Design a binder for these strands. Structure first.
Ligand SMILES: Nc1ncnc2c1ncn2[C@@H]1O[C@H](COP(=O)(O)OP(=O)(O)OP(O)(O)=S)[C@@H](O)[C@H]1O
Ligand SMILES: Nc1ncnc2c1ncn2[C@@H]1O[C@H](COP(=O)(O)OP(=O)(O)OP(O)(O)=S)[C@@H](O)[C@H]1O
Ligand SMILES: Nc1ncnc2c1ncn2[C@@H]1O[C@H](COP(=O)(O)OP(=O)(O)OP(O)(O)=S)[C@@H](O)[C@H]1O
Ligand SMILES: [Mg+2]
Ligand SMILES: [Mg+2]
Ligand SMILES: [Mg+2]
Lengths: 292, 418, 269, 162, 317, 266
DNA sequence: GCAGACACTA
């Protein structure tokens, strides 16, 4: 069948695919099949890229029979896959088995489910005509502006409060202190006025936060990093951080932001694009108002 | 600083810009509404912008409410937290309904809720209809002011139905409320030249120190009379006067250039414009003025029905035949801007050619197509009933064409004898 | 015009009585529903004209002190009321299942309003709700709106109430179809029989095959709309067993049997 | 990739030197990109002249490996309404660089079918976000384009092939 | 990162803006006084309306305009509810403004905004005109509803004369230090037809593609405008000359037939030398050819027939 | 001014703001040395509700410039700030006015949210004076809350306080309207109720009833059970002088919260 | 624009 993947615990797959639902008109996922595992990447308007990686150890029947460069692609829809696995795995002790199949190239994506003498076979025809390949909103680690590690629960509360209030434009602030009083917050401007969601500074749930000087090795204290990010990009990672343990924040001088989600556990990587320029000269007043 | 039209608001009934007859027949209308039993439950005001359609009622409530300034003006920009805009107006009506005694606050709905979506437009009719036939003791006065202004043309309007063509009382309100017995429709007219000139005199003599500072005291008369004659809006006139007074000089003032009416356009096409002697510039300016009306059906029918009133049907039959032939040829262009231009140009050229025999004209009539459609619908439902009753006892298939042509008179004739 | 009946709590018929509420949400979402009160134990109610046909009878013989009389000459009386207000009386009565047996449900037909009497206790609270509209229809409309229709052959006997996984499979079809937003069915006479449902799309190929289910000509292919999501909700019927019939490649019925009464649903092509 | 396509899509130019006929336009665009300034190129002409082939070859030559990410292609095949120009175009033409500080090119192929409101939103976009992103408009009928758009875009005429 | 001349050389003060001396003087006077009421600015695109509004707001407020105003343009969701809410909040939030200064609501490209939003703006003005003022930047005043214009002083911008555009071109040339030719400048002015932005784009293209600005280079990069060619075609005496002009100026240059018909209709609307009967006959023939083009027949024979019929009705045997 | 509260009294504060935000879009809050007063004037000037928080409600009242400072804060903007987040709690909630409303939220953990709503400052407390101008009916709000939770206010009906002979027969019904020829354009869906005679605490012989709205009658009762008041927390009272013309007064006495509502009848 | 009837002092 050129591809095999048997899954018993479909709850983990259901909640993993549920992190890609906030995308409007969800479709066109570039699923990667590799010996390491399965990775799902989805991009919206070439401004935000999210990658969800499933390890080989997650599947109990991973074979990956192939005689090629070990780089094979297929494009299918999200809403079909998202609702495919959530419907079953109900009641108790059902041990529902999920089977993945793909006959190399040109064949539909076959999904087989078994639940109490009840069998299904779902086929997904792939879209591989004008796959431009390459792509990727990646970044170089040599010029990382700063790095931060925060708990998922702390960030989820900030994002949930950031959404319902509005805040169509949001700001990211990073500032270190010689007295270990590191400052990092997700502040924003809306019709309400100024909102200052000040994240905690203690080491209880903020594991590490240091600001670099564009070399990723020279840590500097007293410097401030201001990031101007759209609200639409932040709304996508709100549900991703809803069920998570540690959230890693990393951005460079180029302005792209890399967010790593940890929840063996799976890893979710989200890439974001900074807006054009700071509104007026708000970078001056962000430092001035928060310092007061 | 402060706007002149805001700082010079009237304080009594002798300062408002309104005709004597209009003041009299709104005073008699509002006086009888305050009685416990009133012939008209609500008052409807329809007219152009800046015609004192709201301030007159404001001082009227100022001098009639304390008999037994309490005005409950609806604010459409209210949201009301977690309340839909459709239910906001419903809650406003019931909120102001409980003011029949002691308070007696008049209701002045100047800013009516926007009616463009299908759901919110249909709700606006029965909301005031439910307040009419309600058997409740006493009645608080309610005045609705609607400004007669045509909505400018937009893109991708799909079917392009009514209301969106022209924001007027007739378009939005349906027939049940228009000729309801408990309703009075007091139309409003633009401010007259004499009243505008008197008000500009009063403003100029009130601003004597400012006008005499510059070289405007000698020039003021020409500017104010030009402003008064050019437009009929008092607010726009005051704005233009304030702009000119602030201006140092050597500046050509501008005016709204308000759009003409439907019958006004019909008269312009048939009779002509005295302001613009040149024929080419009159039609070209009219096109860029209101293309939204010319690029619309029933205008060519209006030209077709009113072209015989140029000389009471006493002009050249050959010219009439040429005009009707040109309109018929224009009708084949699928309603294009080029089609409208050619027919109107031909009509104007012909009527200019025969303009010598135009001493006495006639009245124009808006075409009766609605009546023709109504009788067509009545005949259609009558034929449907006839087919329904004639198919329950035997078989009879002849299509719809034979029913209208052959069975429209023969069939009732045979049943008459039997 | 005396339409007076009393509804009281019991042990068995409450599940049959509480099954009535599920359609009431759907019926309120639909246009309306008709009624025909006859004699003392027979009444038929259905949705007037999608293709919503819900011929269902209820044994009013067990109901206490029920009588029908009207000026409709024959034994059949046209009756119609809006089902939106029927939710309010049922939902509020469902909150008082903890205590209260003598409260009853007193209904009186007076002209337009149908007063409903409650005697809930928290010292007693009296509630008097009125049904808004009971407007009738033309007498000739009774014949043209006859809801009695049934067919035979190709009887699928559903799985008996022994394993609860069969209902969950149908309930899975309820949640999935709402999430995506044609349905095809298979039928075989080979003995227990197998059920197969298949969905064909441009790229969505769903097929479900039952290997060893306990449920009981051939090749009855049929293509129909998504209106069957209502019929899956009627399968619950915890008191008794449900019947299903599908043939003629155009029509399908869902015969829900509970106590003496039976409930059927009709789907067109 | 080859010997499996129609002859129309078999000899499509990939570089600027492979486009013939409109020598003046090619030289002017080459000078524009050698100086480092794109004045919102607008291409007009009959079908078959090679406007979209020329602009795709130019974008490839400028970008290289950044065509997949920084270059956006728009057409009549996908939905182009008021919401689309309001959201997708605004989101794309608001981002910074990733690897190279080159300009952002957005290809508005057969843009003459857009609505008047969409055209007005698009031209308010081109005026506001011109300091980093330069759009390209391709059309065959100039009468379907808003005259305000032609003022803000450098019109280039694509003559028939000699 | 070379910024284009349309954005790099845009004016930042009202002094650099030319074309309408009276209007610029009035704007400077009203900024010095500070009593700026509501206004509507309309005109043909590319004359300097929105940049004039921005410069006026700049040199009228300064830091207050930079930091504490809410300017909305066409690139926003201009729904009724959201615009109503946004302007309602912006009418509030008053600061320590000078007594002769007021908030400015810049409204760019308001011609495409829905009528319900106009009514909401009417209510917002009638409720909070004391604190804030509105500025309108559009192309034509017809798209604005009648009641809005009564509360404002409408300002009309005339087409820029050749002198002002030429002076701006010389200033930009001196700033850029580029060689020029008087014939090339005259060709640029002729091609612009009073459009400042088009003139700037053409001059920038000439400079960056050929270096020295010359008439030959400008004519090579961009041809003569089609309204002038069509106007010359319609006024031709002989049919053969008109046919040759049509072919060698539009068929060999790559001009669509429907665009030619539309340009002919526009020229005939604005033509003045022809009589009324001749004008209406030409309009009818243009419409007939237009519907023939729309129905599918888009060949040169239809254009030739239109020209032949126009010549026949002009000569009248 | 600087007022902080750190207790279970945050829920009623959020409840009161949501109640006041429904009546009017903008909430005008007046501060004074005596206590804190929050109220919103209705658009039709038919509903007057004020919630007054005692000085003991907060832990400090360091208010500095009898001056009565007032400001108009958006009700919708304020009601989304004092909300209780799901799966988390607010340890300290405070609001302050600087010499730009300075309101901050301190959760159980070290995370803190700082908000800056915009207000507009004339101590129009004459409405409160008319409220305290000063029959007597006492009914338990706990039993009324059962009827209010299911009143089906979506039809926007009216309430007729029918005391009849002795017992309170609260009704939620809609008046029908006639059409062209006796047509029911608006359907009348009535929902009446009756309370026991002995359940009423105070009553006055005032046969013939009065009519008042329900949306303002709904939100005024939810404030009671929202706050866990084991001590005191007495039921609401009804006060209204004779004839239907004058408005009706309602009061809910609490140890730290003053609840008032005035609704104009007819 | 235009026909029919009224207000108001020249
Ligand atoms: N003598 C006067 N008579 C009438 N209005 C006057 C006078 N002097 C000043 N005004 C002002 O002119 C304006 C006229 O207001 P109205 O015309 O009554 O309002 P409106 O008719 O509702 O306008 P729309 O069409 O609704 S925007 C007001 O702002 C008045 O304050
Ligand atoms: N100058 C040229 N030199 C070589 N091949 C050309 C040239 N112009 C066009 N072609 C060929 O014509 C094909 C189709 O032309 P395209 O450039 O794709 O479309 P177009 O000519 O721009 O017309 P439209 O506006 O898209 S319908 C290309 O794929 C090329 O193979
Ligand atoms: N009087 C002027 N002096 C100098 N540059 C001008 C002048 N008028 C316009 N411009 C230039 O025109 C360009 C943009 O002008 P805009 O004001 O955006 O055009 P517009 O007249 O407003 O037409 P629209 O409606 O905005 S397309 C800038 O590059 C300006 O420098
Ligand atoms: Mg008014
Ligand atoms: Mg192309
Ligand atoms: Mg502009």
């Amino acid at each position: 069948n050129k591809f095999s993947a048997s899954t018993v615990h479909l709850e983990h797959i259901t909640t993993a695919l549920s992190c890609l639902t906030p995308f409007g008109s969800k479709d066109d996922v570039l699923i990667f099949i590799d010996a390491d595992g399965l990775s799902f990447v989805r991009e919206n308007n070439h401004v935000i890229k999210i990658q969800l990686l499933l390890s080989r150890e997650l599947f109990m029947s991973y074979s990956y029979r192939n005689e090629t460069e070990d780089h094979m692609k297929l494009c299918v829809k999200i809403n079909h896959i998202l609702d495919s696995v959530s419907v079953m795995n109900r009641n108790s002790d059902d041990i529902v088995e999920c089977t993945l199949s793909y006959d190399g190239h040109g064949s539909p994506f076959v999904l087989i489910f078994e639940d109490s003498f009840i069998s299904e076979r779902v086929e997904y025809s792939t879209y591989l005509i004008k796959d431009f390949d390459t792509n990727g909103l990646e970044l170089d680690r040599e010029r990382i502006s700063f790095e931060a590690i925060i708990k998922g629960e702390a960030l989820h509360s900030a994002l949930k409060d950031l959404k319902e209030i509005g805040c169509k434009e949001c700001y990211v602030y990073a500032k270190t202190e010689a007295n270990d009083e590191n400052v990092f917050a997700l502040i924003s401007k809306s019709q309400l006025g100024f909102s200052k969601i000040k994240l905690p500074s203690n080491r209880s749930i903020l594991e590490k936060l240091q600001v670099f000087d564009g070399d990723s090795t020279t840590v500097i204290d007293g410097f401030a990093v201001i990031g101007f990010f759209d609200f639409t990009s932040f709304d996508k990672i709100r549900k991703s951080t809803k069920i998570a343990s540690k959230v890693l924040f990393r951005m460079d001088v180029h302005g792209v932001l890399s967010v790593n989600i940890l929840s063996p556990g799976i890893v979710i990587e989200v890439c974001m694009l900074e807006k054009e320029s700071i509104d007026e000269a708000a970078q001056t007043e962000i430092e001035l108002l928060m310092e007061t | 600083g402060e706007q002149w039209y805001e700082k010079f608001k009237p304080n009594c009934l002798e300062q408002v810009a309104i005709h004597k007859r209009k003041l009299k027949d709104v005073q008699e209308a509002l006086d009888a509404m305050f009685l416990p039993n009133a012939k008209h439950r609500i008052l409807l005001l329809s007219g152009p912008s800046g015609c004192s359609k709201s301030t007159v009622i404001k001082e009227l409530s100022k001098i009639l409410v304390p008999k037994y300034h309490k005005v409950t003006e609806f604010r459409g920009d209210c949201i009301v937290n977690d309340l839909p805009q459709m239910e906001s107006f419903s809650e406003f009506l019931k909120g102001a309904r409980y003011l029949v005694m002691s308070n007696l606050s008049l209701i002045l709905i100047e800013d009516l809720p926007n009616v463009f979506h299908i759901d919110t437009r249909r709700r606006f009719q029965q909301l005031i209809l439910q307040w009419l036939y309600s058997s409740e003791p006493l009645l608080p006065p309610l005045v609705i002011c609607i400004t007669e202004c045509e909505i400018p043309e937009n893109d991708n309007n799909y079917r392009k139905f009514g209301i969106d063509y022209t924001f007027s009382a007739e378009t939005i309100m349906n027939k049940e409320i228009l000729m309801h017995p408990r309703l009075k429709r007091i139309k409003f007219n633009p401010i007259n030249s004499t009243l505008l000139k008197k008000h500009l005199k009063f403003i100029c003599v009130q601003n004597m120190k400012m006008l005499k500072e510059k070289n405007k005291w000698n020039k003021r008369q020409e500017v104010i009379d030009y402003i008064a004659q050019e437009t009929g809006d008092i607010r726009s006139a005051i704005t233009t006067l304030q702009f000119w007074a602030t201006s140092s000089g050597s500046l050509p003032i501008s005016t709204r250039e308000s759009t003409i009416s439907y019958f006004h356009a019909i008269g312009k096409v048939i009779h002509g414009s005295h302001s613009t002697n040149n024929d080419n510039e009159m039609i070209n300016n009219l096109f860029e003025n209101s293309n939204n009306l010319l690029s619309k059906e029933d205008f060519k029918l209006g030209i077709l029905e009113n072209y015989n009133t140029f000389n009471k049907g006493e002009f050249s039959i050959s010219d009439a035949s040429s005009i009707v032939d040109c309109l018929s040829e224009c009708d084949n262009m699928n309603g294009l801007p080029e089609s409208n231009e050619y027919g109107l140009r031909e009509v104007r050229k012909t009527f200019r050619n025969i303009s010598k025999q135009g001493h006495n004209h006639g009245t124009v009539y808006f075409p009766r197509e609605w009546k023709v459609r109504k009788l067509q619908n009545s005949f259609k439902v009558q034929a449907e009933d006839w087919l329904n009753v004639s198919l329950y006892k035997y078989n009879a298939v002849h299509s719809f064409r034979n029913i209208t042509l052959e069975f429209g008179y023969y069939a009732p004739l045979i049943r008459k004898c039997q | 015009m005396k339409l007076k009946l009393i509804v009281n709590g019991c042990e068995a018929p409450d599940d049959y009585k509480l099954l009535r509420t599920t359609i009431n949400t759907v019926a309120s979402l639909r246009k309306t529903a008709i009624l025909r009160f006859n004699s003392e134990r027979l009444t038929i109610i259905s949705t007037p004209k999608d293709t919503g046909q819900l011929w269902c009878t209820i044994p009013h013989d067990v109901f206490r002190l029920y009588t029908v009389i009207s000026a409709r000459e024959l034994n059949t009386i046209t009756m119609e009321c809006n089902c939106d207000s029927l939710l309010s009386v049922f939902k509020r009565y469902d909150r008082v299942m903890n205590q209260g047996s003598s409260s009853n449900m007193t209904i009186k037909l007076q002209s337009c309003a149908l007063g409903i009497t409650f005697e809930e206790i928290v010292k007693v609270i009296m509630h008097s709700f009125k049904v808004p509209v009971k407007l009738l229809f033309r007498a000739q409309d009774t014949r043209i709106q006859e809801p009695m229709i049934n067919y035979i052959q190709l009887m699928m006997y559903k799985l008996p109430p022994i394993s609860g996984e069969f209902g969950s499979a149908f309930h899975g079809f309820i949640r999935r179809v709402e999430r995506y937003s044609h349905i095809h069915l298979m039928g075989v006479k080979k003995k227990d029989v197998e059920l197969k449902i298949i969905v064909n799309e441009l790229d969505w190929h769903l097929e479900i095959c039952w290997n060893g289910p306990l449920d009981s000509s051939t090749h009855e292919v049929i293509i129909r709309c998504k209106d069957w999501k209502v019929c899956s909700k009627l399968y619950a019927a915890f008191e008794e067993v449900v019947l299903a019939i599908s043939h003629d490649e155009s029509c399908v019925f869902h015969c829900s049997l509970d106590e003496r009464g039976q409930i059927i649903y009709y789907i067109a092509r | 990739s080859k010997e499996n396509l129609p002859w129309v899509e078999k000899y499509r130019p990939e570089t600027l030197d492979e486009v013939y006929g409109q020598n003046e336009v090619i030289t002017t665009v080459r000078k524009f990109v050698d100086e480092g300034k794109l004045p919102h190129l607008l291409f007009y002409g009959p079908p078959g002249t090679g406007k979209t082939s020329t602009i795709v070859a130019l974008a490839r030559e400028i970008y290289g490996k950044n065509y997949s990410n920084m270059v956006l292609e728009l057409n009549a095949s996908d939905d182009r309404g008021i919401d689309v120009v309001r959201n997708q175009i605004k989101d794309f033409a608001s981002t910074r660089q990733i690897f190279s500080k080159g300009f952002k090119l957005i290809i508005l192929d057969e843009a003459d079918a857009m609505t008047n409101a969409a055209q007005n939103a698009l031209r308010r976009v081109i005026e506001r976000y011109t300091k980093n992103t330069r759009f390209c408009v391709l059309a065959n009928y100039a009468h379907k384009l808003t005259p305000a758009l032609l003022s803000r875009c450098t019109r280039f005429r694509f003559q028939p092939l000699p | 990162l070379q910024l284009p001349w349309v954005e790099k050389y845009r004016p930042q003060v009202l002094s650099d803006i030319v074309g309408n001396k009276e209007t610029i003087d009035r704007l400077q006077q009203i900024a010095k006084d500070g009593n700026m009421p509501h206004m509507i600015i309309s005109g043909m695109p590319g004359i300097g309306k929105t940049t004039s509004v921005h410069c006026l707001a700049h040199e009228l407020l300064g830091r207050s305009y930079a930091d504490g105003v809410l300017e909305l343009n066409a690139s926003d969701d201009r729904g009724i509810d959201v615009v109503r809410n946004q302007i309602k909040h912006f009418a509030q939030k008053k600061l320590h403004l000078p007594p002769g200064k007021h908030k400015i609501v810049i409204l760019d490209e308001a011609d495409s905004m829905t009528a319900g939003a106009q009514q909401a703006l009417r209510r917002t003005m009638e409720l909070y005109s004391n604190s804030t003022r509105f500025a309108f930047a559009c192309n034509q005043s017809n798209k604005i509803i009648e009641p809005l214009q009564s509360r404002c002083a409408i300002l009309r911008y005339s087409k820029l004369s050749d002198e002002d555009v030429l002076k701006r071109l010389l200033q930009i040339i001196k700033l850029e230090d580029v060689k020029y030719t008087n014939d090339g400048l005259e060709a640029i002015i002729f091609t612009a037809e009073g459009d400042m932005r088009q003139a700037i784009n053409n001059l920038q293209s000439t400079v960056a593609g050929h270096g020295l600005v010359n008439a030959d280079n400008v004519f090579k990069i961009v041809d003569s405008p089609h309204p002038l060619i069509v106007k010359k075609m319609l006024l031709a005496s002989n049919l053969e000359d008109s046919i040759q002009i049509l072919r060698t100026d539009l068929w060999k240059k790559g001009y669509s037939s429907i665009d030619i018909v539309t340009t002919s209709f526009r020229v005939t609307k604005n033509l003045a030398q022809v009589k009324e009967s001749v004008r209406l006959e030409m309009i009818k023939e243009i419409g007939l050819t237009h519907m023939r083009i729309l129905e599918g027949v888009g060949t040169y024979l239809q254009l030739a027939s239109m020209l032949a019929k126009i010549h026949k009705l002009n000569n009248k045997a | 001014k600087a007022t902080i509260t750190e207790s279970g009294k945050q829920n009623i504060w959020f409840r009161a703001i949501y109640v006041l935000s429904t009546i009017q879009d903008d909430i005008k809050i007046t501060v004074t040395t005596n206590e804190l007063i929050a109220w919103s004037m209705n658009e039709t000037d038919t509903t007057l509700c004020q919630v007054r928080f005692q000085k003991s409600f907060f832990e400090e009242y360091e208010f500095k410039p009898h001056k009565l400072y007032s400001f108009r804060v958006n009700g919708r903007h304020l009601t989304t700030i004092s909300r209780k987040p799901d799966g988390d709690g607010i340890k300290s909630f405070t609001i302050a006015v600087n010499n730009r409303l300075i309101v901050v939220i301190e959760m159980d953990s070290l995370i803190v949210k700082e908000y800056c709503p915009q207000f507009q400052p004339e101590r129009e407390l004459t409405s409160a004076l008319f409220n305290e101008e000063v029959n007597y009916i006492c009914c338990n709000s706990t039993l009324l809350k059962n009827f209010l939770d299911n009143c089906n206010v979506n039809v926007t009906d009216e309430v007729k306080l029918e005391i009849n002979v002795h017992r309170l027969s609260i009704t939620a019904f809609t008046k029908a309207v006639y059409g062209k020829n006796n047509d029911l354009l608006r359907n009348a869906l009535s929902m009446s109720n009756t309370i026991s005679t002995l359940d009423l605490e105070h009553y006055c012989l005032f046969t013939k009833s009065i009519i008042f709205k329900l949306k303002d009658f709904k939100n005024f009762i939810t404030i009671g059970p929202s706050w866990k008041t084991t001590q005191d927390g007495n039921d609401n009272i009804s006060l209204w002088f004779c004839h239907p013309g004058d408005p009706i007064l309602m009061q809910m006495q609490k140890p730290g919260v003053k609840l008032e509502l005035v609704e104009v009848t007819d």
